[PDB]
């Protein structure tokens, strides 16, 4: 939404662009558009959904 995607070599994060503060990639930090195949250089990862722990109740 407001950052850039980044990896430390093992894990994927989203950061603000002008200062390295990494955060978990989530459905709040990101927005969808369309299927994978349109985009050059897209990578597979998990995106965490903050409603899933509530559905785990």
């Amino acid at each position: 939404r407001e950052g850039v995607f980044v990896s430390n070599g093992t894990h994927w994060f989203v950061t603000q662009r002008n200062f390295y503060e990494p955060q978990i990639i989530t459905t709040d930090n990101t927005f969808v558009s369309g299927n994978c195949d349109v985009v050059i250089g897209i990578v597979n990862n998990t995106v965490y959904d903050p409603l899933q722990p509530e559905l785990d109740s």
Binding site: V4, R17, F31, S33, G34, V38, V39, I40, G41
Partner: protein, 50 residues
């Protein structure tokens, strides 16, 4: 100078004019072809006339 991939730099520059990042990445081949063609027009214009 901080390196960044040129397609991601253009997605920041799109996001700076109020057009969402996915509009570049979904249309990247078209955007590159329009750019490559538009510099071809500049070269032909300057080559054609003094």
């Amino acid at each position: 100078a901080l390196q960044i991939p040129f397609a991601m730099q253009m997605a920041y520059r799109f996001n700076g004019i109020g057009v969402t990042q996915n509009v570049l990445y979904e249309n990247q081949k078209l955007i590159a072809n329009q750019f490559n063609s538009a510099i071809g027009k500049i070269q032909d214009s300057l080559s054609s006339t003094a």
